[PDB]
Amino acid sequence: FEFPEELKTKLQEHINYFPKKRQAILLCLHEIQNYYGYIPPESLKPLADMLELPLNHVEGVVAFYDMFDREDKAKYRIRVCVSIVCHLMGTNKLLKALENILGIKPGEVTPDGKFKIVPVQCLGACSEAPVFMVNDDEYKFESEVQLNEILSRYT
Amino acid sequence: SYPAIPRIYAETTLNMLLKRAKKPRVHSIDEYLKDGGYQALEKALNMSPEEIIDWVDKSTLRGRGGAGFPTGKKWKFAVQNPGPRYFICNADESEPGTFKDRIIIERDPHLLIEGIIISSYAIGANEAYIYIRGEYPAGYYILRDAIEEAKKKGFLGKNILGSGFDLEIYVARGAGAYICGEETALIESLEGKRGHPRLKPPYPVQKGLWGKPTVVNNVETIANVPFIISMGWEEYRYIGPSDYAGPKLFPVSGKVKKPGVYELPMNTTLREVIFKYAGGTLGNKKVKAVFSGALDCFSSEELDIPMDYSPLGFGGTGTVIVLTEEDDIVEAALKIAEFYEHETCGQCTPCRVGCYEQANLLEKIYKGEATEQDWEGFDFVNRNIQPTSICGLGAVAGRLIRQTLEKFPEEWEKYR
Ligand SMILES: Cc1cc2nc3c(=O)[nH]c(=O)nc-3n(C[C@H](O)[C@H](O)[C@H](O)COP(=O)(O)O)c2cc1C
Ligand code: SF4
Ligand code: FES
Ligand SMILES: [Cl-]
């Protein structure tokens, strides 16, 4: 496995950011997922040596943190809040609309690998319930029409 | 340019923490300075760190991160131990219904940054951190840009405002675990390990980051520091008037006409928050319950309680999740149950199995698939998540659900 120049540079920046190299693990793993659309298992070894940590330490971190996905590859991750306020305000309507638009359910990835619905806990935007993320972007769900319009910005 | 942020409604009667944060936009350092920003930092750097701790202690400012610990007292504890010392801003905010902290981060980062600088100076910390949850990417980028603005104006970096004081603020990102909001788990995450809380004692104020005296304060608590120093401790305790000083942010959500963040004094009642400020309920339906995040449950007979930290007060993080007539308490309790099932770090067995069984038994109860044993087991499990727990999650994972079983027995009886 070989990291691309563009990602290696960003990873190195994170590693030199904090006083201790090992502190950059989460930021490095966020950057890896942003580039690939997942955490490739093969990328865990060059990352381990980059932070000066054992491979099993990095593996444990990926497994502990919910945002890091070691299994499925997806260009866009639709994090749909399934917590109390969004549930009470319309999580299932948003889930129904996403199913009508993409033809996929939570934990499923579209055949072309473009989108993946990810059920997550409180997104901290409860006043705007039901809430959903499309990678870093966060929105309030209004309707299927409003959703289809938002989702068309992702290609 | 920053990633898309939801347009969270914000309102204030005090115009302090939300003086700029009431507008949904990133306020630059120029807009912050225009309002008299960084004048408190200038005043603080001419004082001794001891004087600043005394003003914070005298102001009677209490932690806004749930525990309500007096901020001044916490700082006094850390300074009784030799340095180097560390200051950490807790921007993990992951409790359901809580969204008050992000609007300070995303709209007025300089209010938070100045607060961090003053607080770091007060405890002699030359290294500070902002631990921001991973689900706030925009907040992360906004804070990085704002930190660069502060350095470029001489409020951060080396020899800040010619005082000789050096400070670096590092922004760390969380990656999806509510438990990383717990101060010891947060430190573990910052050290690059899994967010597993450590057994207390030791306490972070004596042994925190790298085993050094560490002060962990919530975003909202830190945002109060520039006001304490700018106004003075006296003016600050007079605002309310309540025995629990200062402005307070109330993230109001649920079946209210106007959900959002409300900056109100803590003497304000729960009824006032819902009806006077949030604009009542949708269709004017009767409020059956109010969930204080995922911590407490208040019935319609507890609406006249104050929003302070008194024994009969609202307490917690001031999180208001409104539930009307049409909302099923069992269905709500299930969402609370599901939250603890998903967030237990699994270090403690009664918490690991307790949070799991509570959610799984509640789902069976809710679906009409529960036996008499599943019912009797649900009661047992709810009462036995606390044993051997080494952090606050285990102690409270059954609290709200127990309150619904006690305050809404008629609703549960339908399912039994
Ligand atoms: C499971 C758990 C999660 C917590 N989450 C948060 C959080 O997201 N933000 C926060 O500031 N405090 C949170 N706390 C409280 C912290 O442990 C700590 O008391 C607080 O950051 C201290 O800051 P304060 O004195 O300014 O309130 C949490 C506690 C527990 C037990
Ligand atoms: S009480 Fe629960 S969340 Fe806290 S350390 Fe124990 S298992 Fe983890
Ligand atoms: S409950 Fe969904 S954003 Fe908080
Ligand atoms: Cl206002």
Q: How far apart are CA B240 and CA B412, in angstroms?
A: 39
Q: In this structure, are residues A149 and A138 in contact, taking their beta carbons and an 8 Å threshold?
A: no
Q: In this structure, are residues B268 and B12 in contact, taking their beta carbons and an 8 Å threshold?
A: no
Ligand lying nearest the CA atom of residue A124: 3
Please report, to the nearest 10 degrees, the dihedral formed by the alpha carbons of residues B170, B250, A128, A34 taken in order. 10
Q: In this structure, are residues A92 and A55 in contact, taking their beta carbons and an 8 Å threshold?
A: no
Resolution of the experimental model, in Å, one decimal: 2.1
Domain boundary among A14, A41, A72: A72
Element of type H or E holding B205: none
Whether the ω angle into residue B241 lies within 30 degrees of 0, i.e. cis, is yes
Number of domains in chain B: 4
Q: How far apart are CA B330 and CA A18, in angstroms?
A: 46
CATH code of the domain containing B274: 3.10.20.600
Q: How far apart are CA B360 and CA B368, in angstroms?
A: 13
Partner-chain residue, chosen from B96, B134, B251, that has the shortest CB–CB distance to A30? B134
Q: How far apart are CA A119 and CA A130, in angstroms?
A: 12
Strand order in the sheet with B260-265: B10-12, B260-265, B247-254, B320-324, B287-292, B296-299
Q: How far apart are CA A104 and CA A116, in angstroms?
A: 8
Let me know if A115 is exposed, middle or buried by CB neighbors in 10 A (0-12, 13-18, 19+).
buried
Q: How far apart are CA B396 and CA A70, in angstroms?
A: 32
DSSP label at A30?
H
Place of tokens 């490739």: A40
Ligand lying nearest the CA atom of residue B196: 2
DSSP label at B180?
G
Q: How far apart are CA A105 and CA B252, in angstroms?
A: 30
Residues B116 and B199 reside in one and the same domain: yes
Dihedral sign computed on CA atoms, order B85, B89, B94, B97: positive
Q: Which two tokens stand for residue B227?
A: 């006001």
**Could you tell me the CA-to-CA distances from B6 to A138, B3, B173 in Å, in that order?**
6, 10, 20
Measured in residues, chain A has a length of 155
Q: Which two tokens stand for residue B73?
A: 């007292």
Domain that holds residue A11: 1-72
Q: Letter for the amino acid at B14?
A: L
Measured in residues, chain B has a length of 416
Residues B315 and B336 reside in one and the same domain: no
Q: Phi/psi at B296 (nearest 5 deg)?
A: -130, 165
What are the residues whose beta carbons fall under 8 Å from the beta carbon of B151, sequence distance 6 or more? B157
> Angle B135-B61-B89 (CA atoms, 0-180°, nearest 5)?
30
What are the residues whose beta carbons fall under 8 Å from the beta carbon of B368, sequence distance 6 or more? B415
**From ligand 3's centre to the CA of A49, what distance in Å?**
38
Residues A15 and A84 reside in one and the same domain: no
Of B359, B276, B283, B362, the C-alpha closest to B320 is: B276
Residues B274 and B128 reside in one and the same domain: no
Dihedral sign computed on CA atoms, order A26, A28, A34, A39: negative
> What is the DSSP secondary-structure string of B64-124?
SSSS--BHHHHHHHHHTS-S--EEEEEE---STT--HHHHHHHH-HHHHHHHHHHHHHHTT
Residues A57 and A102 reside in one and the same domain: no
Whose alpha carbon is nearest atom 8 of ligand 2?
A: B345
Q: In this structure, are residues B48 and B56 in contact, taking their beta carbons and an 8 Å threshold?
A: no
> Best of B335, B341, B343 to disrupt the A interface by mutation (most A CBs within 10 Å)?
B335
Q: How far apart are CA B273 and CA B117, in angstroms?
A: 33
Strand order in the sheet with A131-134: A115-120, A76-81, A131-134, A137-140
Q: How far apart are CA B67 and CA B269, in angstroms?
A: 20
Residues A55 and A91 reside in one and the same domain: no
Whether the ω angle into residue B202 lies within 30 degrees of 0, i.e. cis, is yes
User: What radius of gyration do chain B's Cα atoms show?
Assistant: 22
Cβ pairs A/B, distance under 8 A? 155
Q: Letter for the amino acid at B304?
A: D
Residues A40 and A84 reside in one and the same domain: no
Experimental approach = X-ray
Dihedral sign computed on CA atoms, order B226, B230, B231, B232: positive
Q: Letter for the amino acid at A85?
A: V
Place of tokens 């809040």: A81
Q: Which two tokens stand for residue B197?
A: 């809380």
Residues B414 and B390 reside in one and the same domain: yes
Of A145, A147, A148, the C-alpha closest to A132 is: A147
Domain boundary among B212, B238, B264: B238
Q: How far apart are CA B344 and CA B363, in angstroms?
A: 18
Residues B81 and B96 reside in one and the same domain: yes
Domain boundary among B279, B295, B327: B327
Q: Which two tokens stand for residue B346?
A: 């699994």
Residues B9 and B56 reside in one and the same domain: yes
Residues B217 and B102 reside in one and the same domain: yes
A36 and B CB contact within 8 Å: no
Residues B76 and B221 reside in one and the same domain: yes
Residues A63 and A87 reside in one and the same domain: no
Q: In this structure, are residues B2 and B141 in contact, taking their beta carbons and an 8 Å threshold?
A: yes
Number of domains in chain A: 2
Of B245, B243, B406, B259, the C-alpha closest to B320 is: B259
Domain that holds residue B20: 1-60
CATH code of the domain containing B192: 3.40.50.11540
Beta bridge pairs of residue B131: B90, B172
Q: Letter for the amino acid at A17?
A: Y
Q: Residue B101: CB within 6 Å of ligand 1?
A: no
Domain boundary among B39, B60, B81: B60
Chain breaks in chain B (C to N over 2.5 A) after: none
Contacts of B317 in chain A (CB under 8 A): none
Quote the minimal CA–CA distance from A3 to chain B in Å.
21
> What is the DSSP secondary-structure string of B373-398?
HHHHHHHHHHHSSSTT-SSHHHHHTT
How many other β-carbons are positioned within 10 Å of the β-carbon of residue A93? 15
Residues A77 and A151 reside in one and the same domain: yes
Q: Which two tokens stand for residue B100?
A: 């008050």
Domain boundary among A72, A99, A117: A72
Residues A84 and A46 reside in one and the same domain: no
Q: Which two tokens stand for residue B63?
A: 């932690």
Q: In this structure, are residues B84 and B173 in contact, taking their beta carbons and an 8 Å threshold?
A: no
Give the side-chain half-sphere CA count within 13 A for B42: 8
What is the CB < 6 Å shell around ligand 3?
Answer: A 81, 83-86, 122-126, 129, 131; B 96
Q: In this structure, are residues B166 and B127 in contact, taking their beta carbons and an 8 Å threshold?
A: no
Q: How far apart are CA B253 and CA B273, in angstroms?
A: 11
Residues A103 and A147 reside in one and the same domain: yes
How many other β-carbons are positioned within 10 Å of the β-carbon of residue A143? 12
Q: Which two tokens stand for residue A146?
A: 């409003």
Residues A92 and A16 reside in one and the same domain: no
What are the residues whose beta carbons fall under 8 Å from the beta carbon of B85, sequence distance 6 or more? B78, B79, B123, B124, B125, B212, B213, B214, B215
Q: How far apart are CA B344 and CA A65, in angstroms?
A: 12
Partner-chain residue, chosen from B4, B127, B251, that has the shortest CB–CB distance to A138? B4
Let me know if B372 is exposed, middle or buried by CB neighbors in 10 A (0-12, 13-18, 19+).
exposed
Residues B100 and B216 reside in one and the same domain: yes
Residues B171 and B120 reside in one and the same domain: yes
Q: Phi/psi at A109 (nearest 5 deg)?
A: -115, 135
Q: Phi/psi at B300 (nearest 5 deg)?
A: -60, -25
B261 annotated ligand binder: no
Q: Residue B67: CB within 6 Å of ligand 1?
A: yes
Q: Which two tokens stand for residue B397?
A: 């994972």
How many other β-carbons are positioned within 10 Å of the β-carbon of residue B151? 16
Residues B150 and B282 reside in one and the same domain: no
Residues A33 and A78 reside in one and the same domain: no
Residues A68 and A117 reside in one and the same domain: no
Quote the minimal CA–CA distance from A135 to chain B in Å.
9
Domain boundary among A53, A72, A91: A72
Q: How far apart are CA B289 and CA B327, in angstroms?
A: 9
> What is the DSSP secondary-structure string of B37-78?
TTHHHHHHHTS-HHHHHHHHHHHT-B-SSSS--BHHHHHHHH
Q: Give the β-pairing of B214-218 and B86-91.
A: parallel
A13 and B CB contact within 8 Å: no
Of B236, B252, B379, the C-alpha closest to B322 is: B252
Q: Which two tokens stand for residue B112?
A: 């938070």
Q: How far apart are CA B130 and CA B55, in angstroms?
A: 23
Q: In this structure, are residues B167 and B126 in contact, taking their beta carbons and an 8 Å threshold?
A: yes
Q: Which two tokens stand for residue A113?
A: 């690998």
Q: Phi/psi at B382 (nearest 5 deg)?
A: -55, -35
Beta bridge pairs of residue B324: B287
Residues B89 and B232 reside in one and the same domain: yes
In A83-142, the residues whose Cβ lies within 8 Å of chain B are 83-85, 87-89, 120-129, 131, 133, 135-140
Name the percent of chain B in helix, strand, coil, to the closest 5.
45, 15, 40
* A-chain residue closest to B342, CA distance: A121
